[PDB]
Amino acid sequence: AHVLTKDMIQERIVALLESFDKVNDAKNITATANLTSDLGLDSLDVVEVVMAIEEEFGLEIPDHDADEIKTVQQAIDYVSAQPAA
Amino acid sequence: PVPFSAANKKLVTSMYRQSLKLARNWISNRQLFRQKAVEIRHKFDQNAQISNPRLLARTLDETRAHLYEFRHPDPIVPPSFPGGTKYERNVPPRMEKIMQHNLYEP
Amino acid sequence: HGPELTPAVPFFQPYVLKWAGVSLGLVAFYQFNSSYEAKNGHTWVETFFHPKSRE
Amino acid sequence: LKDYYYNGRRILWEIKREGAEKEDWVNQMYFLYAPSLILLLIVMVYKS
Amino acid sequence: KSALSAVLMNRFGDAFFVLGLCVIAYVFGTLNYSTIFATAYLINTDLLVLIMLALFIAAMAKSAQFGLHNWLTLAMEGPTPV
Amino acid sequence: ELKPSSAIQRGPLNKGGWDAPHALHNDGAIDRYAHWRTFYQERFKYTRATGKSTLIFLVAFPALIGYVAYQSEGLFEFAGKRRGESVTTR
Amino acid sequence: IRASFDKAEEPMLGDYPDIDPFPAQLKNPYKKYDDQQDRRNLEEPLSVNDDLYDMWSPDRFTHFKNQDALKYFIGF
Ligand SMILES: CCCCCCCCCCC(CCCCCCCCCC)(CO[C@H]1O[C@@H](CO)[C@H](O[C@@H]2O[C@@H](CO)[C@H](O)[C@@H](O)[C@@H]2O)[C@@H](O)[C@@H]1O)CO[C@H]1O[C@@H](CO)[C@H](O[C@@H]2O[C@@H](CO)[C@H](O)[C@@H](O)[C@@H]2O)[C@@H](O)[C@H]1O
Ligand SMILES: CCCCCCCCCCCCCCCCCC(=O)OC[C@H](COP(=O)(O)OCCN)OC(=O)CCCCCCCCCCCCCCCCC
C-alpha cells in the first residue's frame, strides 16, 4: 500500500507553502513558523491555505479545528492525527 | 455587528471557508474555478474595512443569504469521512473479554 | 508470502458428522424401501402400520 | 458438591481447558427426543 | 438502511405478485405454464387485466420503473461486484 | 401480650445462586423514556388529535370496509369465464 | 414541540421534560459524541417520538422545502 510518515507531511506542507506567493519569503519557513506573524498572512489567506492544505492531503476540516492550526507544527501533527491520507 | 475582533474574525473566516468549499463543487474546470476563487477573494478584499456596525451587519446577513442560495446537493467528501462512501466499512471491534451471565452454562 | 495463516482445524467436525450421518441414513432408508417395494409389493414400514379396519 | 464444582468452573478438575463434556440434558434429548422426532418424520412420509 | 429500503420496495412488488398468484390459482385452477397458456385465449379479458396488472406491479417494482426506482441508486452502498 | 410464638426462628429470604456480573450499563434516559412509553395509557387524555384518530380508525374505517364487504358478497365469480361473459351476478 | 404530532402529544406527558425534537442526522458529525454512529451523548434526554428523530429514522432531506418539492415533482 502507501504509508505516510512525518517526513512526508513536512516536505509536502513546506512544498505547498513555497508555491504560495503571498508569504513574506521562501526561506523563513520552518516547522516553528506562525502563519499569522512570521509569514505575513492576513486572517483570510490563512483560510486560503487551510483550504489548500485540506485539499492537498485529501481530508476535510470542520470550522472549529481549522481555526486553531495557526502554527505549521500544529498543522503537521493535526494532519498526522488522522488515519486517512 | 462587531468591529475588528476575535469573534467577528471567527465568523468570517468560517464564512470564507464555506464559500470556497461551496464554490469547489460547482465548478468542474480547474482554472475556471480558480478565476472564480480569485474573484470572490477580491469580493472579500473590497470589504473588511467597514467600521460601522449597521451596514457591516447588513452586508453580513445578505452575504449569508447569498451564500445560502448557492448551496449544493452533493458536497465533495473524502470517502473515509462521515459524508463519504468508505465511512465505517470495517470498524475494528474493541478488545473485550467475555462477560458471563450464568453459573452453569457459557 | 501470500496470506497469513490461522491454526489448523479438523475437517470432520461433530456437526458435519451428525447432520451428514442422519441425512445419508434417511436417503439410504428411502432407497431401501423403494428396493423392497419392487420385490414384495409393499413398503417395509407399512409392515408396522396396523390400524383397525374402518368397519 | 455441585456448588463447589460450578463456582470453581466460573472463577477458574478446574485448572484445564478442553471440550469433551456432557451437560445434563443431552442424554435424553439426543437419544430419546431426536430419534422420536426422526421417527415422526418417517411415519409421516410413509403414511403419506 | 439501503438494504432495508431495497427489500421493502421489492416486498411491495411481492405483495402484488401474491395477489396476482391468488387470482391465477383461482381462475385457471393451476400454476403450470402449459395449462395456463393452453387456456389463456378463452378467459375473460377483465380477469386478465386484473391478473396482468398485479403481475406488472410486481415486475415494475423489481425492474425498477418510475414509481419504484429509488432503491437501485440506493443500492450503491453495496460493493462494486454486488 | 399478643406476640406470635417464641418458637418461630424466622430469618431472611434469599433467591440463591450466583450473582452474574453486570453485562449492561443502564441508561437513565432510555429507561425513563421506555418506562414512559410502556405506561402511556395512565397519562392518556382525550384531545382533538386523539378524537380524530379514534373516529377515523375505530368507527370510520370499520364502517367503510363494512359497506364494501356487505355490498360485494355474492357479486363476483371469476372461476370459469370467457370473453363477453359477466363475472358479476347482480 | 416543533412538529404537529409532537404538539399533539403535549397534554399526555406529565413528569417528562418536553425536549425540542432535533433530527439526529442534521447534528454535526465532527463534534465527538459517545456513540459517533447514533450521534448522541450518553445521558441526553430523549424526545417523545424519538424514533422519528433517530439515526435509524428516515433520511429527511435538507435542500428543498417539502411543499416546494411536491410542487416540482407534480410539475415534472
Ligand atoms: C365484540 C364484537 C362482537 C362480535 C361482532 C359481530 C356482531 C355481529 C354484527 C354485524 C351486524 C351490524 C351490527 C350494527 C351495530 C354494530 C355494533 C358493534 C359493537 C357494539 C358494542 C351486521 O348486520 C347488518 O350489517 C349492515 C351493515 O352494512 C348491513 O345493512 C345494509 O344491508 C345490506 C343488504 O345486503 C347492504 O349490503 C349493506 O350495505 C347495508 O348497510 C346488513 O348486511 C346487516 O343487516 C349485526 O347484524 C346481524 O344481525 C342478525 C340480527 O340479529 C342478522 O341475521 C338475522 O337473524 C334473524 C334475527 O332477527 C332475522 O330474523 C333474520 O332475518 C336475519 O338473517 C345477521 O345476519 C346480522 O345482520
Ligand atoms: C398502484 C401500483 C403502482 C404504484 C406506483 C407508485 C407507488 C408509490 C408508492 C410506493 C410505495 C413503496 C413501498 C413503501 C414501503 C417502502 C419502505 C422503505 O423503503 O423503507 C425505507 C426506509 C429507509 O429509507 P431511507 O432512510 O430514506 O433511505 C435509506 C438509504 N440511505 O426504511 C425505514 O425508515 C424504516 C422505518 C419505516 C419503514 C416504512 C414504514 C411505513 C411504511 C408505510 C407503507 C404503507 C403501505 C400500505 C398503506 C396502506 C395500508 C392500508
XYZ file of C-alpha atoms and ligand atoms in Angstrom:
662
model
C 0.000 0.000 0.000
C 1.153 3.546 0.646
C 2.373 4.715 4.026
C 2.932 8.222 5.081
C 5.383 9.242 7.737
C 6.029 12.666 9.270
C 8.957 13.456 6.950
C 6.466 13.395 4.118
C 3.856 15.691 5.708
C 6.784 18.020 6.423
C 8.073 18.152 2.861
C 4.522 18.414 1.468
C 3.284 21.286 3.675
C 6.526 23.221 3.066
C 6.183 22.449 -0.662
C 2.664 23.833 -0.541
C 3.913 26.975 1.195
C 6.796 27.724 -1.164
C 4.457 27.714 -4.182
C 2.101 30.126 -2.331
C 3.172 33.664 -3.186
C 1.602 35.966 -0.535
C 4.100 34.604 2.023
C 6.888 37.020 3.053
C 9.675 34.883 1.560
C 10.590 31.268 0.853
C 13.342 30.725 3.454
C 11.986 31.946 6.786
C 9.988 28.674 6.528
C 10.476 26.036 9.239
C 8.074 23.887 11.374
C 8.026 26.554 14.096
C 6.579 29.218 11.881
C 3.472 31.178 12.728
C 1.456 31.756 9.625
C -0.152 34.825 11.272
C 3.036 36.753 12.026
C 6.182 35.082 10.627
C 4.954 34.542 7.068
C 2.894 37.756 6.915
C -0.593 36.432 6.271
C -3.863 38.225 6.767
C -6.713 36.480 8.548
C -8.241 35.078 5.374
C -5.310 33.722 3.370
C -4.565 31.670 6.417
C -8.014 30.401 5.479
C -6.992 30.017 1.807
C -4.023 27.957 2.916
C -6.274 25.895 5.253
C -8.422 25.150 2.183
C -5.275 24.334 0.192
C -3.845 22.066 2.887
C -7.124 20.192 3.277
C -7.416 19.540 -0.472
C -3.698 18.699 -0.500
C -3.992 15.825 1.990
C -7.390 14.724 0.701
C -9.070 15.351 4.042
C -11.738 17.666 5.419
C -11.740 20.002 8.380
C -14.619 21.389 10.463
C -14.558 25.078 11.290
C -13.604 24.685 14.988
C -10.408 22.766 14.158
C -9.331 24.848 11.161
C -9.020 27.940 13.367
C -6.520 26.536 15.839
C -3.822 25.286 13.494
C -2.055 28.633 13.490
C 1.491 27.272 13.602
C 2.952 24.982 10.990
C 3.826 22.368 13.646
C 0.247 22.193 14.965
C -0.865 21.732 11.351
C 1.644 18.910 10.799
C 0.677 16.909 13.884
C -3.022 17.640 13.345
C -2.817 16.226 9.820
C -0.810 13.306 11.212
C -3.573 12.641 13.762
C -5.984 11.252 11.122
C -5.782 7.767 9.558
C -6.746 8.972 6.068
C -4.045 10.160 3.689
C -22.494 43.593 14.418
C -18.997 43.977 15.880
C -15.807 45.686 14.583
C -12.311 44.080 14.445
C -12.432 41.271 16.998
C -11.658 37.632 17.509
C -15.326 36.596 17.226
C -16.051 38.522 14.020
C -12.820 37.004 12.707
C -14.102 33.544 13.722
C -17.363 34.220 11.865
C -15.986 35.411 8.525
C -13.011 33.030 8.463
C -15.586 30.260 8.613
C -17.714 32.061 6.009
C -14.714 32.260 3.654
C -14.063 28.541 4.327
C -17.695 27.869 3.453
C -17.804 29.855 0.189
C -14.500 28.410 -1.017
C -15.698 24.862 -0.271
C -19.089 25.623 -1.760
C -17.613 27.051 -4.958
C -15.378 23.957 -5.124
C -18.144 21.518 -6.062
C -19.994 23.692 -8.582
C -17.080 24.149 -10.980
C -15.656 21.167 -12.849
C -12.758 23.017 -14.503
C -9.612 23.927 -12.600
C -8.812 27.387 -13.997
C -12.482 28.449 -14.184
C -12.648 27.552 -10.510
C -9.521 29.466 -9.663
C -10.521 32.510 -11.699
C -13.744 32.365 -9.658
C -11.839 31.846 -6.396
C -9.630 34.882 -7.005
C -12.825 36.748 -7.952
C -14.559 36.160 -4.621
C -11.173 36.705 -2.927
C -11.414 40.157 -4.497
C -15.004 40.363 -3.185
C -13.811 39.749 0.373
C -10.952 42.224 -0.018
C -13.152 45.114 -1.214
C -14.872 44.757 2.158
C -13.191 44.161 5.587
C -12.504 47.895 6.003
C -16.031 48.796 7.153
C -16.180 50.383 10.601
C -19.945 50.696 11.027
C -21.950 48.027 12.829
C -25.130 48.865 10.816
C -24.066 48.041 7.231
C -21.457 45.632 8.480
C -24.343 43.560 9.825
C -26.484 44.297 6.729
C -23.753 43.169 4.297
C -23.019 40.289 6.696
C -26.561 38.913 6.723
C -27.167 39.326 2.975
C -23.852 37.621 2.062
C -25.048 34.909 4.413
C -28.224 34.721 2.295
C -26.184 34.885 -0.939
C -24.129 32.033 0.495
C -27.328 30.161 1.368
C -28.810 30.226 -2.143
C -25.747 28.805 -3.975
C -25.828 25.639 -1.894
C -25.020 22.289 -3.451
C -26.827 18.909 -3.292
C -23.693 16.750 -3.044
C -20.747 18.184 -1.164
C -17.470 16.660 -2.259
C -16.458 14.487 0.734
C -13.457 12.169 1.037
C -14.862 8.674 1.374
C -13.475 7.613 4.766
C -15.151 10.657 6.394
C -18.768 10.901 7.633
C -20.326 12.014 4.377
C -18.397 9.559 2.265
C -18.581 6.042 0.900
C -15.711 4.373 2.803
C -17.075 5.613 6.126
C -17.457 2.780 8.678
C -16.741 -0.118 6.362
C -14.673 -2.268 8.730
C -14.852 -0.667 12.158
C -12.376 -2.675 14.256
C -14.140 -4.267 17.226
C -12.930 -3.145 20.619
C -10.942 -5.699 22.598
C -13.359 -7.161 25.133
C -13.224 -10.326 27.161
C -16.429 -12.291 27.599
C -18.724 -11.242 30.430
C -20.624 -14.203 31.825
C -24.253 -14.383 32.876
C -24.823 -17.978 34.012
C -23.207 -20.156 36.660
C -23.627 -23.405 34.749
C -23.571 -22.700 31.020
C -21.472 -20.381 28.894
C 4.278 -14.570 1.345
C 0.650 -14.613 0.258
C -1.928 -14.736 3.045
C -1.252 -15.096 6.765
C -2.392 -18.414 8.252
C -4.531 -19.316 11.286
C -4.312 -22.629 13.272
C -5.307 -25.978 11.825
C -8.895 -27.224 12.151
C -10.066 -30.828 11.595
C -12.451 -31.301 8.698
C -14.976 -33.728 10.205
C -16.459 -31.518 12.894
C -19.140 -33.077 15.156
C -21.950 -31.244 13.376
C -20.634 -32.366 9.971
C -20.722 -35.968 11.204
C -24.165 -35.657 12.823
C -26.022 -33.877 10.012
C -24.340 -35.889 7.237
C -24.987 -39.177 9.034
C -28.667 -38.501 9.696
C -29.467 -37.266 6.173
C -27.461 -40.032 4.460
C -29.226 -42.583 6.662
C -32.619 -41.182 5.687
C -31.796 -41.253 1.966
C -30.418 -44.798 2.291
C -33.571 -45.903 4.117
C -35.801 -44.341 1.451
C -33.871 -46.186 -1.255
C -34.156 -49.379 0.816
C -37.948 -49.095 0.873
C -38.003 -48.430 -2.869
C -35.811 -51.538 -3.194
C -38.179 -53.616 -1.054
C -41.369 -52.376 -2.737
C -40.400 -53.900 -6.111
C -39.733 -57.313 -4.568
C -42.697 -57.622 -2.204
C -45.349 -55.210 -3.483
C -45.354 -53.131 -0.298
C -43.132 -50.838 1.800
C -41.092 -52.170 4.744
C -42.601 -49.549 7.061
C -46.232 -50.390 6.212
C -45.451 -53.799 7.732
C -45.688 -51.905 11.043
C -48.830 -49.949 10.117
C -51.591 -51.810 11.960
C -54.734 -49.689 12.218
C -58.157 -51.166 12.767
C -60.386 -51.714 9.751
C -62.866 -48.956 9.042
C -65.899 -51.124 9.789
C -20.543 -30.508 45.814
C -22.369 -29.170 42.737
C -21.901 -25.677 44.164
C -18.158 -26.232 44.618
C -17.896 -27.606 41.081
C -19.685 -24.855 39.202
C -18.369 -21.833 41.134
C -14.837 -23.082 40.615
C -15.615 -23.598 36.937
C -16.837 -19.998 36.751
C -13.909 -18.350 38.541
C -11.280 -20.647 37.044
C -10.913 -30.696 37.857
C -10.909 -26.904 37.448
C -7.474 -25.851 36.053
C -7.745 -27.284 32.486
C -9.314 -26.317 29.133
C -10.831 -28.876 26.738
C -14.198 -29.598 25.076
C -15.337 -33.160 25.784
C -18.266 -32.600 28.172
C -21.895 -33.691 28.506
C -24.427 -31.361 30.089
C -27.414 -32.827 31.911
C -29.987 -32.622 29.127
C -28.025 -34.186 26.246
C -28.630 -37.763 27.403
C -32.376 -37.783 26.722
C -32.633 -35.145 24.010
C -30.202 -36.649 21.512
C -31.029 -40.264 22.340
C -34.764 -40.016 23.054
C -36.192 -36.732 21.702
C -34.276 -36.660 18.414
C -34.880 -40.299 17.315
C -38.551 -39.953 18.274
C -38.723 -36.849 16.080
C -36.986 -38.619 13.179
C -39.419 -41.491 13.783
C -42.296 -38.975 13.487
C -40.826 -37.791 10.164
C -40.546 -41.338 8.794
C -44.067 -42.249 9.918
C -45.430 -39.091 8.234
C -43.516 -39.705 4.998
C -44.567 -43.323 4.591
C -48.050 -42.654 5.950
C -48.489 -40.201 3.061
C -30.813 1.379 5.717
C -30.181 0.954 1.982
C -30.702 -2.814 2.096
C -33.847 -2.172 4.148
C -35.262 0.194 1.510
C -34.384 -2.190 -1.341
C -36.087 -5.171 0.258
C -39.161 -3.224 1.283
C -39.616 -1.944 -2.307
C -39.247 -5.491 -3.584
C -41.699 -6.666 -0.894
C -44.265 -4.146 -2.167
C -43.936 -5.846 -5.546
C -44.066 -9.277 -3.882
C -47.399 -8.443 -2.252
C -48.830 -7.586 -5.654
C -47.406 -10.807 -7.085
C -49.082 -12.787 -4.275
C -52.363 -11.088 -5.265
C -51.899 -11.984 -8.932
C -50.820 -15.510 -7.975
C -54.019 -15.985 -5.968
C -56.073 -14.906 -8.971
C -54.028 -17.264 -11.220
C -54.743 -20.239 -8.969
C -58.386 -19.172 -8.753
C -59.184 -18.652 -12.435
C -57.092 -21.365 -14.072
C -57.002 -23.737 -11.124
C -53.281 -24.314 -11.623
C -49.932 -22.572 -11.691
C -48.292 -24.521 -14.536
C -47.246 -22.523 -17.605
C -48.508 -25.159 -20.049
C -52.079 -25.309 -18.752
C -52.321 -21.534 -18.295
C -51.064 -20.778 -21.800
C -53.187 -23.534 -23.345
C -56.342 -21.923 -21.909
C -55.374 -18.243 -21.895
C -57.225 -17.145 -25.046
C -60.572 -18.325 -23.664
C -60.551 -16.447 -20.330
C -62.437 -13.152 -19.901
C -60.437 -10.011 -20.535
C -61.307 -8.147 -17.316
C -59.923 -11.110 -15.353
C -56.734 -10.997 -17.395
C -56.433 -7.218 -16.994
C -56.639 -7.712 -13.213
C -54.063 -10.537 -13.271
C -51.586 -8.825 -15.582
C -51.863 -5.501 -13.763
C -50.964 -7.195 -10.467
C -48.088 -9.088 -12.097
C -46.945 -5.887 -13.792
C -46.834 -4.005 -10.483
C -44.596 -6.864 -9.285
C -42.384 -6.644 -12.394
C -42.384 -2.838 -12.213
C -41.166 -2.938 -8.620
C -38.319 -5.345 -9.307
C -37.326 -3.987 -12.728
C -37.320 -0.522 -11.204
C -39.678 1.792 -13.046
C -40.552 5.366 -12.101
C -42.865 4.763 -9.152
C -40.289 2.479 -7.580
C -36.837 3.450 -8.847
C -35.420 4.737 -5.527
C -33.729 1.528 -4.427
C -31.331 0.946 -7.355
C -29.476 4.195 -6.737
C -29.704 3.406 -3.027
C -28.007 0.042 -3.667
C -24.573 1.500 -4.424
C -23.680 1.154 -0.744
C -23.090 -2.490 -1.507
C -19.760 -3.082 -3.227
C -18.878 -2.931 -6.911
C -19.272 -6.625 -7.923
C -22.529 -6.887 -5.975
C -49.422 -9.591 75.380
C -50.330 -10.957 71.961
C -46.981 -11.717 70.358
C -46.508 -14.539 67.809
C -44.808 -17.553 69.269
C -41.369 -17.861 70.845
C -40.690 -20.890 68.646
C -40.666 -19.305 65.180
C -36.939 -18.926 64.269
C -37.714 -16.668 61.349
C -34.923 -15.478 59.116
C -34.185 -13.663 55.875
C -35.118 -14.770 52.356
C -32.527 -15.266 49.629
C -33.037 -16.078 45.971
C -29.926 -18.243 45.826
C -27.239 -18.989 43.289
C -24.679 -16.864 41.500
C -24.567 -13.100 41.159
C -23.986 -12.590 37.451
C -21.755 -9.551 36.830
C -23.366 -6.636 35.035
C -23.267 -7.157 31.278
C -25.167 -3.953 30.565
C -24.627 -0.347 31.585
C -28.038 1.126 32.352
C -29.077 4.327 30.638
C -31.202 6.548 32.815
C -32.630 8.435 29.847
C -33.531 5.303 27.862
C -35.017 3.673 30.975
C -37.101 6.765 31.752
C -38.209 7.038 28.110
C -39.217 3.391 27.936
C -40.961 3.431 31.306
C -42.813 6.461 29.995
C -43.892 4.676 26.798
C -44.841 1.346 28.424
C -47.264 3.014 30.850
C -48.547 5.592 28.351
C -52.201 4.789 28.962
C -52.475 6.007 32.549
C -51.493 9.502 31.407
C -53.523 9.338 28.189
C -56.177 12.025 27.719
C -58.774 12.884 25.090
C -57.838 15.740 22.757
C -58.731 16.792 19.224
C -55.916 14.745 17.649
C -56.984 11.820 19.817
C -60.595 12.270 18.728
C -59.591 12.460 15.069
C -57.602 9.223 15.388
C -60.321 7.463 17.399
C -63.134 8.288 14.977
C -61.007 7.634 11.888
C -59.709 4.214 12.959
C -62.444 2.876 15.257
C -65.672 3.963 13.535
C -64.930 5.429 10.082
C -62.650 2.725 8.641
C -64.801 -0.152 10.062
C -67.916 1.441 8.540
C -66.144 1.910 5.199
C -64.834 -1.620 4.786
C -68.108 -2.852 6.259
C -70.015 -1.114 3.460
C -67.586 -2.606 0.936
C -67.811 -6.106 2.448
C -71.610 -6.217 2.614
C -72.157 -4.691 -0.843
C -69.851 -7.208 -2.542
C -70.689 -10.641 -1.106
C -72.286 -12.564 -3.944
C -71.066 -10.216 -6.675
C -68.028 -11.839 -8.205
C -67.363 -15.242 -9.646
C -64.168 -15.476 -11.719
C -63.870 -19.266 -11.802
C -64.546 -20.201 -15.398
C -65.284 -17.188 -17.577
C -64.989 -16.189 -21.214
C -64.954 -13.126 -23.433
C -68.354 -11.484 -23.407
C -69.454 -13.189 -20.189
C -70.495 -11.466 -16.991
C -68.340 -12.028 -13.935
C -70.821 -10.477 -11.528
C -74.280 -11.794 -10.673
C -76.356 -8.730 -9.761
C -42.515 20.945 20.132
C -41.647 21.699 16.515
C -43.815 19.117 14.752
C -47.601 18.958 14.797
C -47.770 15.440 16.252
C -45.137 16.428 18.825
C -47.558 19.226 19.668
C -50.373 16.671 19.749
C -48.758 14.598 22.488
C -48.082 17.667 24.688
C -51.017 17.206 27.157
C -50.356 13.492 27.724
C -46.875 13.949 29.182
C -46.569 14.750 32.844
C -43.267 14.494 34.769
C -41.453 14.445 31.420
C -39.078 17.178 30.256
C -40.608 18.122 26.818
C -37.491 18.324 24.633
C -37.293 20.234 21.341
C -37.124 17.480 18.687
C -33.999 17.715 16.565
C -33.044 15.128 13.927
C -30.018 13.053 14.834
C -28.620 13.289 11.293
C -28.669 17.095 10.988
C -26.376 17.277 14.009
C -22.723 17.971 13.342
C -20.708 14.833 12.515
C -17.430 16.317 13.762
C -18.474 17.013 17.352
C -17.297 13.943 19.255
C -20.197 12.023 20.782
C -20.151 8.955 22.991
C -21.573 6.996 20.067
C -20.292 8.505 16.828
C -22.847 6.429 14.930
C -26.073 7.494 16.644
C -24.623 10.986 17.373
C -25.757 11.035 20.966
C -24.231 11.820 24.335
C -24.569 9.183 26.998
C -27.280 10.665 29.237
C -29.084 13.025 26.889
C -32.884 13.280 27.263
C -34.920 11.568 24.559
C -37.897 13.291 22.944
C -41.316 11.773 22.713
C -41.484 10.148 19.258
C -37.705 9.858 19.375
C -37.657 7.050 16.811
C -38.809 9.646 14.279
C -35.715 11.720 15.144
C -33.233 8.878 15.488
C -30.404 7.953 13.170
C -32.454 4.905 12.109
C -35.347 7.172 11.086
C -35.996 8.469 7.509
C -33.311 10.443 5.716
C -35.012 13.889 5.962
C -33.664 15.936 3.057
C -32.177 19.368 3.557
C -32.107 21.081 0.161
C -35.760 21.767 -0.722
C -38.746 22.539 1.427
C -41.176 19.634 1.171
C -44.086 21.655 -0.253
C -41.666 23.107 -2.831
C -40.521 19.621 -3.813
C -44.103 18.302 -4.140
C -44.780 21.244 -6.460
C -41.648 20.440 -8.521
C -42.416 16.703 -8.699
C -46.079 17.054 -9.693
C -44.808 19.758 -12.025
C -42.466 17.442 -13.951
C -67.258 -7.512 20.209
C -67.796 -7.744 18.784
C -68.915 -8.811 18.846
C -68.904 -9.641 17.539
C -69.126 -8.681 16.345
C -70.139 -9.383 15.405
C -71.584 -8.987 15.818
C -72.428 -9.062 14.513
C -72.535 -7.611 13.909
C -72.775 -7.015 12.458
C -74.266 -6.556 12.130
C -74.483 -4.999 12.385
C -74.392 -4.521 13.876
C -74.514 -2.961 13.885
C -74.015 -2.432 15.268
C -72.509 -2.812 15.428
C -72.156 -2.798 16.944
C -70.633 -3.067 17.141
C -70.316 -3.415 18.624
C -71.100 -2.500 19.602
C -70.617 -2.756 21.047
C -74.451 -6.790 10.549
O -75.796 -6.712 10.035
C -76.115 -5.740 9.233
O -74.849 -5.051 8.692
C -75.267 -3.871 7.920
C -74.023 -3.024 7.650
O -73.829 -2.842 6.272
C -75.974 -4.300 6.678
O -77.008 -3.258 6.318
C -77.358 -2.985 4.974
O -77.991 -4.115 4.228
C -77.170 -4.836 3.212
C -78.060 -5.587 2.261
O -77.267 -6.504 1.544
C -76.203 -3.953 2.425
O -75.289 -4.829 1.746
C -75.422 -3.062 3.316
O -74.500 -2.234 2.532
C -76.305 -2.199 4.153
O -75.526 -1.351 5.017
C -76.602 -5.650 6.727
O -75.774 -6.579 5.948
C -76.896 -6.319 8.033
O -78.295 -6.225 8.286
C -75.260 -7.419 13.040
O -76.423 -7.903 12.371
C -76.622 -9.274 12.403
O -77.962 -9.293 12.942
C -78.750 -10.526 12.814
C -79.952 -9.964 13.531
O -79.942 -10.477 14.844
C -78.781 -10.966 11.320
O -79.380 -12.281 10.978
C -80.764 -12.300 11.063
O -81.227 -13.274 12.088
C -82.652 -13.083 12.493
C -82.715 -12.308 13.787
O -83.862 -11.492 13.846
C -83.529 -12.437 11.406
O -84.887 -12.877 11.567
C -83.003 -12.820 10.057
O -83.883 -12.261 9.027
C -81.593 -12.393 9.773
O -80.983 -13.300 8.836
C -77.374 -11.127 10.901
O -77.301 -11.628 9.520
C -76.545 -9.887 11.003
O -77.014 -8.953 10.023
C -50.628 1.037 -7.661
C -49.297 0.405 -8.058
C -48.397 1.409 -8.779
C -47.886 2.409 -7.752
C -46.743 3.250 -8.315
C -46.391 4.359 -7.320
C -46.068 3.752 -5.953
C -45.839 4.843 -4.915
C -45.904 4.208 -3.532
C -44.689 3.306 -3.352
C -44.731 2.603 -2.005
C -43.495 1.720 -1.958
C -43.488 0.836 -0.718
C -43.431 1.699 0.527
C -42.567 0.958 1.533
C -41.110 1.316 1.269
C -40.409 1.215 2.612
C -38.978 1.719 2.548
O -38.434 1.866 1.508
O -38.327 1.997 3.748
C -37.221 2.824 3.600
C -36.842 3.443 4.933
C -35.410 3.901 4.745
O -35.456 4.801 3.687
P -34.354 5.983 3.719
O -33.890 6.134 5.143
O -34.927 7.290 3.218
O -33.102 5.526 2.763
C -32.062 4.859 3.388
C -30.867 4.805 2.451
N -29.861 5.739 2.911
O -36.894 2.492 5.945
C -37.174 2.983 7.227
O -37.015 4.121 7.521
C -37.697 2.006 8.275
C -38.889 2.590 9.018
C -40.011 2.929 8.044
C -40.432 1.710 7.239
C -41.684 2.087 6.468
C -42.817 2.276 7.471
C -44.008 2.980 6.834
C -44.403 2.275 5.544
C -45.812 2.694 5.148
C -46.207 1.943 3.882
C -47.698 1.651 3.949
C -48.136 0.875 2.712
C -49.554 0.367 2.957
C -50.523 1.542 3.074
C -51.955 1.016 3.085
C -52.286 0.441 4.458
C -53.771 0.095 4.497
